[PDB]
């Protein structure tokens, strides 16, 4: 079915639930023919979060890119995750990926960027995290005194 | 002179004597003592003096020999120069008409990476530029490369001298004999030239071309060298599902297990794999290719199955090959393992058919019945096959032979409810000649459960009930059993009700019925009569009585997970169980410091005294398994000196003959009676010497059995679990907490660790740490843990016993 | 101090301690102001007193030169910092990693630069993180960080030096993060991922670049996947004028 | 403590003694968990009569003390204390009566959890003749 | 070097004669040869056996082992072939293997070792070739 170039027949033969090895071979074949459509479905069934994202995050509306990177957020596959959510000026779960991983500073930083002034809460949670994670001279528990700066220090 | 390190005075004498033989022998004796590693510079002037110019090869060859293994070290008769006594008159040696002396000289001279001989080795390629042998031309490409290696990666070594300076490697390719010392870093033009040479090869030389440049477009072109690369290249062009059918790999492979059965067993494995790639369920593992030897046409002559029969084994070839073979029958053909295991088991298990498969040792017979029977429990189809074969097992009609047979089949009935009704009548038959427990137990259970089906029972049971043999365990089994199934469906002179009467008497009561039972007093202390006595609410009838129990099977019973099963064929299993699968005053102050992961014993050496201690040396010693990674090296400990001297430490070594205490540290100084003193830096223990090793549950269990561990102590501060203090401390007495021996629940749940080590003490060390952490209203002693300990004569057992309490040291100078 | 024989203390009466062994040969020892003065001083937070106190009768390795790197709010730590490791340690315990990078440098090691860079992101400032992360070669982590941080100039630098690595979750990121996607289109072209390059480009309305990729390679751009292939991609990149590489700080 | 000895060379009998005694007393003097853990290992590699003993004892142990029931379940599901041969049959009965049934029977059955017979004190006379032989 | 040393051993627990092509394995040579060749190189009557991460190739002759050792390898055929050629050369010098006679012809054997394997690369030798040198 791959040889014939019968994508559909190869697709039934894989069978939508699992047989990921079949689907990865099909997904590549689908990208070759530049039939992106069959490819997105093959990659989904394959799973292939890293690869699947690359085809998928080319959306500009993030239409089917969040799912295949939902995990990535909290797996420390943050990079895969950021591309998914930030793609049309939206913060879909951009911030959230950063909180999940423990890369709290980065959520604060993002919050400042697009300023809905969410920063005040993120900086706090983060600052608290510095005090627990042995910093005393950059301890952060202040509003601008102990290193980092909560939202009134910050600005648009 | 095999190895005699003091003999250097005699060698000097022997080295010049006016007799050439003596001189040769002497120089030879020097060589053998250096090679072992012993004293040699005293001699040097003597050695060098006779031999130097001469074309007489033997002494020259001998001296030439000694210049590649110690030239640098020896300096009495040589000293340091550009044209040393290694090469000054060995320019003559290089330029002699005899190829051997020149060739030899060239060969050692260029071999050295010495910089005090760099110039003399360079035009030393002259000695072999003319090639009187294959040896001369090879000697030359290797010597130019060795010159290139010795600081001449540029223009001193790369072009030609008059024919080679890094160009024999080019020349060799087109010359009659090849050899390419060009493996790395050398002329591109020669590399290219070797490729051309693949065709016009010289076979030794081809192995040299080939280490450098491999992969051919061809099949070959000839010779072992090309051939050896070729199987590597073939595996590339078809990786897919092993090699399957081994290529030119086969030739080396046999020798790889020359001891002797293991080759066949291995060979059998590959041959089975190769046949087919099946489903690959539990013990159906055959990989390789799906079709390449098929299985099972009906027009194939004389068929595939003939080779398949070998693999079904009783031992039909020898035991190593046997274990491999049983797995291999299972692997090509079954449903999982079950199908081919039943066939295989039918052959192995005890019969009246063949007396080469029956034996009067009861356990093996029994086990074989259980193996056959487990296949049914696994898979349904097998139930139908098993029951008639089981009746044949019975037909042997020895007391014991029946007995084993009855014991499994009765378990099968618990699984297989009113399906094996048919068997009961066969099963009674051999129950009358009796000298054992087992027959009574089993028979009474079949005849008991099966009562609806038959009606014989007073008659069958009664001969046995008034017969003797061994009857402990008989009681237990008859007690739960005799009444069962349908309330009044038998009668010979005792209906099912007489049976319930009997069943109760046999359990622990008394009653005239079946001419009284053999015994009444039950088996092992806990069992007793009473449960069943209460029972038989509805007289031997499928309801909520003995019958229920009998026609039901305790927990899950499926597969070959050992739930009413036994896991393949009984003989193969013994081997698998066996497989453990084990994986002058002196003052010192000191602390241990670690910076950038360097572990060092800091020592400060102090002379509080005005007196002289000059002659001061500092040493850290190797005691046994403790070692210095570098002693403290300052010459300190002088009049009113304070010094910090660092002695690096290791924990792992090999036993030295000196004392085995804490840490020995030695400072030396002035004094002539006690020039060396031993004084201490802080604590290190005997425990270091133990070596950590680990066990799995099987190795632990085997060792438990192997040697006693009754010895126990209770150690305080085992309040905590295995993971915390106990692991860390156990680690320091080179132990490790591995697998469990626990059985946790709502009433159980002491933490159990299985410990192992293999001490350098001629013992192992094992222990079980049981942490008595309350999981009951009445704990042992509350929190604390009792460590049950051993070692192989329990001399390290004790180390485990106390080094799981506490352990800490610190200082702050 | 050590004597040269095994011994039993006879007892302590006075400054001296007196000892006798089994055979009963004596040793006496004056209790010194060596080890004792040094830590009597360190306990009462004196470092000035303690420098004199440092002698080679009591220096060891970790009671003076590395035991004094054992405060989570550095005090003792400040005083001994001579080891490149002790210096590294000191820095995370403050939370100011400016010193870390140098110790990390002098430890000659990448791992330290990425770990201190992470601590750096924690004190809040991403300039310091960039430098570290750049030399550990985590251009892709940086690429990810960078719109989060709100830089666009720095975000481009990461894209190129991650292009060459073919880090598809590095080079790939930045194009999304700026309002136009063109960065990806070329990187992907070099990857040979013509499909992916077209989809990305096309959606932003850079159909011309998307077409270039199709024409150079296999065409067919018409196909509509489970994601859009031509729907607007535009994002307004970072509304902040001062970025979070310029995250404010005072530091205590 | 004695059971700590040797896992399966200690014999059917010692395991039967700790097992019978731990069953019958139902330790609150020490935690039954050590006893259970010790017996659990012994059963695997020792004779049928003890493994059968161990299930039945456990059942009586259940009926006398409520607490105990959770350990009975981990032990009995195992291929050891049930589902061997003799051990299975007794177990199927003993288990089913504890698990399934009322435990009128189980309750009745434990009167302390006593032995199967109470003889005299056999050892001492035996010993008298046996020593100077 | 690919070939650390070429060594004749007695399983008396010592390297009887041995060759260090370039200064590396001096004393090291004796300890390896002494432990491993005693156990048949830890073999089972297999020409290749590897122990303590060093490839030992061998042939037993009496209480003696003729041993080739490598810890790296370029080809299968080659390692055996230098050992083999060595085994043509060794009875010419010592009339089989035997510690006393091996000891006496340290020079002979040692010279052959340098000639046979040069800087760890297996050259070739022959009994006639050997003659020019000891002449």
PDB file of N, CA and C in Angstrom, chain B residues 112-172:
ATOM      1  N   UNK B 112      61.926   3.359  18.813  1.00  0.00           N
ATOM      2  CA  UNK B 112      61.962   4.225  19.952  1.00  0.00           C
ATOM      3  C   UNK B 112      61.332   5.485  19.520  1.00  0.00           C
ATOM      4  N   UNK B 113      60.647   6.161  20.409  1.00  0.00           N
ATOM      5  CA  UNK B 113      60.074   7.506  20.262  1.00  0.00           C
ATOM      6  C   UNK B 113      61.022   8.473  21.004  1.00  0.00           C
ATOM      7  N   UNK B 114      62.241   8.015  21.392  1.00  0.00           N
ATOM      8  CA  UNK B 114      63.320   8.711  21.983  1.00  0.00           C
ATOM      9  C   UNK B 114      63.708   9.923  21.162  1.00  0.00           C
ATOM     10  N   UNK B 115      64.147  11.039  21.880  1.00  0.00           N
ATOM     11  CA  UNK B 115      64.399  12.320  21.259  1.00  0.00           C
ATOM     12  C   UNK B 115      65.942  12.402  21.299  1.00  0.00           C
ATOM     13  N   UNK B 116      66.589  11.563  22.023  1.00  0.00           N
ATOM     14  CA  UNK B 116      68.081  11.483  22.087  1.00  0.00           C
ATOM     15  C   UNK B 116      68.599  10.489  21.071  1.00  0.00           C
ATOM     16  N   UNK B 117      67.772  10.155  20.040  1.00  0.00           N
ATOM     17  CA  UNK B 117      68.061   9.218  19.087  1.00  0.00           C
ATOM     18  C   UNK B 117      67.270   9.513  17.913  1.00  0.00           C
ATOM     19  N   UNK B 118      66.663  10.727  17.839  1.00  0.00           N
ATOM     20  CA  UNK B 118      65.798  11.092  16.787  1.00  0.00           C
ATOM     21  C   UNK B 118      66.522  11.243  15.455  1.00  0.00           C
ATOM     22  N   UNK B 119      67.650  11.942  15.430  1.00  0.00           N
ATOM     23  CA  UNK B 119      68.515  12.152  14.311  1.00  0.00           C
ATOM     24  C   UNK B 119      69.053  10.840  13.862  1.00  0.00           C
ATOM     25  N   UNK B 120      69.635   9.900  14.657  1.00  0.00           N
ATOM     26  CA  UNK B 120      70.236   8.650  14.191  1.00  0.00           C
ATOM     27  C   UNK B 120      69.211   7.684  13.610  1.00  0.00           C
ATOM     28  N   UNK B 121      67.948   7.743  14.018  1.00  0.00           N
ATOM     29  CA  UNK B 121      66.901   6.894  13.455  1.00  0.00           C
ATOM     30  C   UNK B 121      66.431   7.366  12.119  1.00  0.00           C
ATOM     31  N   UNK B 122      66.591   8.626  11.798  1.00  0.00           N
ATOM     32  CA  UNK B 122      66.063   9.165  10.566  1.00  0.00           C
ATOM     33  C   UNK B 122      66.799   8.605   9.375  1.00  0.00           C
ATOM     34  N   UNK B 123      68.123   8.689   9.152  1.00  0.00           N
ATOM     35  CA  UNK B 123      68.699   8.109   7.946  1.00  0.00           C
ATOM     36  C   UNK B 123      68.890   6.585   8.284  1.00  0.00           C
ATOM     37  N   UNK B 124      68.263   5.952   9.357  1.00  0.00           N
ATOM     38  CA  UNK B 124      68.384   4.566   9.723  1.00  0.00           C
ATOM     39  C   UNK B 124      67.483   3.748   8.783  1.00  0.00           C
ATOM     40  N   UNK B 125      66.663   4.459   7.944  1.00  0.00           N
ATOM     41  CA  UNK B 125      65.788   3.854   7.008  1.00  0.00           C
ATOM     42  C   UNK B 125      66.568   3.309   5.740  1.00  0.00           C
ATOM     43  N   UNK B 126      67.863   3.761   5.620  1.00  0.00           N
ATOM     44  CA  UNK B 126      68.805   3.339   4.684  1.00  0.00           C
ATOM     45  C   UNK B 126      69.107   1.855   4.663  1.00  0.00           C
ATOM     46  N   UNK B 127      69.069   1.261   5.858  1.00  0.00           N
ATOM     47  CA  UNK B 127      69.323  -0.149   6.188  1.00  0.00           C
ATOM     48  C   UNK B 127      68.344  -1.131   5.622  1.00  0.00           C
ATOM     49  N   UNK B 128      67.254  -0.601   5.204  1.00  0.00           N
ATOM     50  CA  UNK B 128      66.151  -1.433   4.731  1.00  0.00           C
ATOM     51  C   UNK B 128      65.545  -0.742   3.530  1.00  0.00           C
ATOM     52  N   UNK B 129      66.235   0.135   2.821  1.00  0.00           N
ATOM     53  CA  UNK B 129      65.664   0.824   1.636  1.00  0.00           C
ATOM     54  C   UNK B 129      65.754  -0.067   0.432  1.00  0.00           C
ATOM     55  N   UNK B 130      66.776  -0.935   0.498  1.00  0.00           N
ATOM     56  CA  UNK B 130      66.986  -2.012  -0.352  1.00  0.00           C
ATOM     57  C   UNK B 130      66.263  -3.100   0.349  1.00  0.00           C
ATOM     58  N   UNK B 131      65.507  -4.055  -0.413  1.00  0.00           N
ATOM     59  CA  UNK B 131      64.635  -4.947   0.254  1.00  0.00           C
ATOM     60  C   UNK B 131      65.002  -6.314  -0.158  1.00  0.00           C
ATOM     61  N   UNK B 132      65.846  -6.971   0.655  1.00  0.00           N
ATOM     62  CA  UNK B 132      66.294  -8.305   0.413  1.00  0.00           C
ATOM     63  C   UNK B 132      65.261  -9.354   0.807  1.00  0.00           C
ATOM     64  N   UNK B 133      64.132  -8.997   1.450  1.00  0.00           N
ATOM     65  CA  UNK B 133      63.117  -9.934   1.875  1.00  0.00           C
ATOM     66  C   UNK B 133      61.900  -9.214   2.044  1.00  0.00           C
ATOM     67  N   UNK B 134      60.836  -9.943   2.292  1.00  0.00           N
ATOM     68  CA  UNK B 134      59.484  -9.320   2.499  1.00  0.00           C
ATOM     69  C   UNK B 134      59.490  -8.576   3.774  1.00  0.00           C
ATOM     70  N   UNK B 135      60.366  -9.162   4.708  1.00  0.00           N
ATOM     71  CA  UNK B 135      60.645  -8.739   6.063  1.00  0.00           C
ATOM     72  C   UNK B 135      61.337  -7.367   5.883  1.00  0.00           C
ATOM     73  N   UNK B 136      62.301  -7.163   4.968  1.00  0.00           N
ATOM     74  CA  UNK B 136      62.986  -5.922   4.850  1.00  0.00           C
ATOM     75  C   UNK B 136      62.047  -4.824   4.398  1.00  0.00           C
ATOM     76  N   UNK B 137      61.184  -5.075   3.393  1.00  0.00           N
ATOM     77  CA  UNK B 137      60.303  -4.051   2.980  1.00  0.00           C
ATOM     78  C   UNK B 137      59.242  -3.712   4.052  1.00  0.00           C
ATOM     79  N   UNK B 138      58.664  -4.743   4.773  1.00  0.00           N
ATOM     80  CA  UNK B 138      57.720  -4.507   5.845  1.00  0.00           C
ATOM     81  C   UNK B 138      58.284  -3.732   7.019  1.00  0.00           C
ATOM     82  N   UNK B 139      59.545  -4.058   7.347  1.00  0.00           N
ATOM     83  CA  UNK B 139      60.389  -3.492   8.417  1.00  0.00           C
ATOM     84  C   UNK B 139      60.520  -2.035   8.099  1.00  0.00           C
ATOM     85  N   UNK B 140      60.783  -1.733   6.812  1.00  0.00           N
ATOM     86  CA  UNK B 140      60.809  -0.346   6.365  1.00  0.00           C
ATOM     87  C   UNK B 140      59.556   0.431   6.457  1.00  0.00           C
ATOM     88  N   UNK B 141      58.390  -0.051   5.989  1.00  0.00           N
ATOM     89  CA  UNK B 141      57.146   0.777   6.134  1.00  0.00           C
ATOM     90  C   UNK B 141      56.838   0.963   7.587  1.00  0.00           C
ATOM     91  N   UNK B 142      57.021  -0.037   8.456  1.00  0.00           N
ATOM     92  CA  UNK B 142      56.756   0.123   9.887  1.00  0.00           C
ATOM     93  C   UNK B 142      57.740   1.104  10.559  1.00  0.00           C
ATOM     94  N   UNK B 143      59.042   1.049  10.224  1.00  0.00           N
ATOM     95  CA  UNK B 143      60.033   1.981  10.728  1.00  0.00           C
ATOM     96  C   UNK B 143      59.762   3.414  10.250  1.00  0.00           C
ATOM     97  N   UNK B 144      59.359   3.725   9.043  1.00  0.00           N
ATOM     98  CA  UNK B 144      59.064   5.096   8.614  1.00  0.00           C
ATOM     99  C   UNK B 144      57.820   5.657   9.411  1.00  0.00           C
ATOM    100  N   UNK B 145      56.824   4.866   9.640  1.00  0.00           N
ATOM    101  CA  UNK B 145      55.704   5.229  10.309  1.00  0.00           C
ATOM    102  C   UNK B 145      56.086   5.541  11.751  1.00  0.00           C
ATOM    103  N   UNK B 146      56.978   4.660  12.404  1.00  0.00           N
ATOM    104  CA  UNK B 146      57.465   4.817  13.762  1.00  0.00           C
ATOM    105  C   UNK B 146      58.323   6.102  13.836  1.00  0.00           C
ATOM    106  N   UNK B 147      59.061   6.500  12.780  1.00  0.00           N
ATOM    107  CA  UNK B 147      59.771   7.732  12.744  1.00  0.00           C
ATOM    108  C   UNK B 147      58.838   8.891  12.743  1.00  0.00           C
ATOM    109  N   UNK B 148      57.681   8.821  11.946  1.00  0.00           N
ATOM    110  CA  UNK B 148      56.659   9.783  11.837  1.00  0.00           C
ATOM    111  C   UNK B 148      55.947  10.054  13.183  1.00  0.00           C
ATOM    112  N   UNK B 149      55.747   8.986  13.937  1.00  0.00           N
ATOM    113  CA  UNK B 149      55.190   8.969  15.232  1.00  0.00           C
ATOM    114  C   UNK B 149      56.157   9.722  16.186  1.00  0.00           C
ATOM    115  N   UNK B 150      57.458   9.476  16.010  1.00  0.00           N
ATOM    116  CA  UNK B 150      58.478  10.099  16.855  1.00  0.00           C
ATOM    117  C   UNK B 150      58.795  11.454  16.255  1.00  0.00           C
ATOM    118  N   UNK B 151      58.017  12.454  16.614  1.00  0.00           N
ATOM    119  CA  UNK B 151      58.122  13.849  16.544  1.00  0.00           C
ATOM    120  C   UNK B 151      58.393  14.312  15.145  1.00  0.00           C
ATOM    121  N   UNK B 152      57.944  13.672  14.112  1.00  0.00           N
ATOM    122  CA  UNK B 152      58.322  14.021  12.803  1.00  0.00           C
ATOM    123  C   UNK B 152      57.075  13.810  12.053  1.00  0.00           C
ATOM    124  N   UNK B 153      56.094  14.616  12.304  1.00  0.00           N
ATOM    125  CA  UNK B 153      54.794  14.623  11.692  1.00  0.00           C
ATOM    126  C   UNK B 153      54.760  15.595  10.522  1.00  0.00           C
ATOM    127  N   UNK B 154      55.940  16.102  10.037  1.00  0.00           N
ATOM    128  CA  UNK B 154      56.027  17.358   9.246  1.00  0.00           C
ATOM    129  C   UNK B 154      57.031  16.834   8.153  1.00  0.00           C
ATOM    130  N   UNK B 155      58.019  17.675   7.767  1.00  0.00           N
ATOM    131  CA  UNK B 155      58.927  17.345   6.743  1.00  0.00           C
ATOM    132  C   UNK B 155      60.082  16.432   7.211  1.00  0.00           C
ATOM    133  N   UNK B 156      60.636  16.207   8.427  1.00  0.00           N
ATOM    134  CA  UNK B 156      61.645  15.193   8.815  1.00  0.00           C
ATOM    135  C   UNK B 156      61.199  13.817   8.493  1.00  0.00           C
ATOM    136  N   UNK B 157      59.901  13.571   8.245  1.00  0.00           N
ATOM    137  CA  UNK B 157      59.521  12.191   8.001  1.00  0.00           C
ATOM    138  C   UNK B 157      58.249  12.407   7.249  1.00  0.00           C
ATOM    139  N   UNK B 158      58.223  12.082   5.891  1.00  0.00           N
ATOM    140  CA  UNK B 158      57.164  12.195   5.033  1.00  0.00           C
ATOM    141  C   UNK B 158      57.594  11.911   3.604  1.00  0.00           C
ATOM    142  N   UNK B 159      58.744  12.361   3.059  1.00  0.00           N
ATOM    143  CA  UNK B 159      59.016  12.152   1.648  1.00  0.00           C
ATOM    144  C   UNK B 159      59.788  10.845   1.454  1.00  0.00           C
ATOM    145  N   UNK B 160      60.938  10.809   0.739  1.00  0.00           N
ATOM    146  CA  UNK B 160      61.815   9.690   0.606  1.00  0.00           C
ATOM    147  C   UNK B 160      63.208  10.038   1.104  1.00  0.00           C
ATOM    148  N   UNK B 161      63.956   8.983   1.474  1.00  0.00           N
ATOM    149  CA  UNK B 161      65.292   9.275   1.966  1.00  0.00           C
ATOM    150  C   UNK B 161      66.166   9.164   0.756  1.00  0.00           C
ATOM    151  N   UNK B 162      65.984   7.984   0.069  1.00  0.00           N
ATOM    152  CA  UNK B 162      66.488   7.655  -1.267  1.00  0.00           C
ATOM    153  C   UNK B 162      65.384   6.752  -1.846  1.00  0.00           C
ATOM    154  N   UNK B 163      64.446   6.204  -1.030  1.00  0.00           N
ATOM    155  CA  UNK B 163      63.364   5.415  -1.610  1.00  0.00           C
ATOM    156  C   UNK B 163      62.133   5.407  -0.621  1.00  0.00           C
ATOM    157  N   UNK B 164      62.395   5.534   0.737  1.00  0.00           N
ATOM    158  CA  UNK B 164      61.355   5.577   1.740  1.00  0.00           C
ATOM    159  C   UNK B 164      61.699   6.589   2.797  1.00  0.00           C
ATOM    160  N   UNK B 165      60.665   7.354   3.244  1.00  0.00           N
ATOM    161  CA  UNK B 165      60.803   8.108   4.480  1.00  0.00           C
ATOM    162  C   UNK B 165      59.413   8.105   4.921  1.00  0.00           C
ATOM    163  N   UNK B 166      58.473   7.689   4.096  1.00  0.00           N
ATOM    164  CA  UNK B 166      57.046   7.588   4.541  1.00  0.00           C
ATOM    165  C   UNK B 166      56.403   7.166   3.202  1.00  0.00           C
ATOM    166  N   UNK B 167      57.115   6.464   2.280  1.00  0.00           N
ATOM    167  CA  UNK B 167      56.811   6.171   0.912  1.00  0.00           C
ATOM    168  C   UNK B 167      56.920   4.711   0.636  1.00  0.00           C
ATOM    169  N   UNK B 168      57.431   3.859   1.599  1.00  0.00           N
ATOM    170  CA  UNK B 168      57.394   2.337   1.511  1.00  0.00           C
ATOM    171  C   UNK B 168      55.941   1.908   1.471  1.00  0.00           C
ATOM    172  N   UNK B 169      55.084   2.724   2.137  1.00  0.00           N
ATOM    173  CA  UNK B 169      53.654   2.499   2.288  1.00  0.00           C
ATOM    174  C   UNK B 169      52.997   2.596   0.880  1.00  0.00           C
ATOM    175  N   UNK B 170      53.409   3.557   0.043  1.00  0.00           N
ATOM    176  CA  UNK B 170      53.044   3.684  -1.370  1.00  0.00           C
ATOM    177  C   UNK B 170      53.584   2.517  -2.198  1.00  0.00           C
ATOM    178  N   UNK B 171      54.861   2.224  -2.015  1.00  0.00           N
ATOM    179  CA  UNK B 171      55.620   1.231  -2.756  1.00  0.00           C
ATOM    180  C   UNK B 171      55.231  -0.158  -2.572  1.00  0.00           C
ATOM    181  N   UNK B 172      54.791  -0.437  -1.386  1.00  0.00           N
ATOM    182  CA  UNK B 172      54.383  -1.745  -0.961  1.00  0.00           C
ATOM    183  C   UNK B 172      53.192  -2.273  -1.736  1.00  0.00           C
TER     184      UNK B 172
END
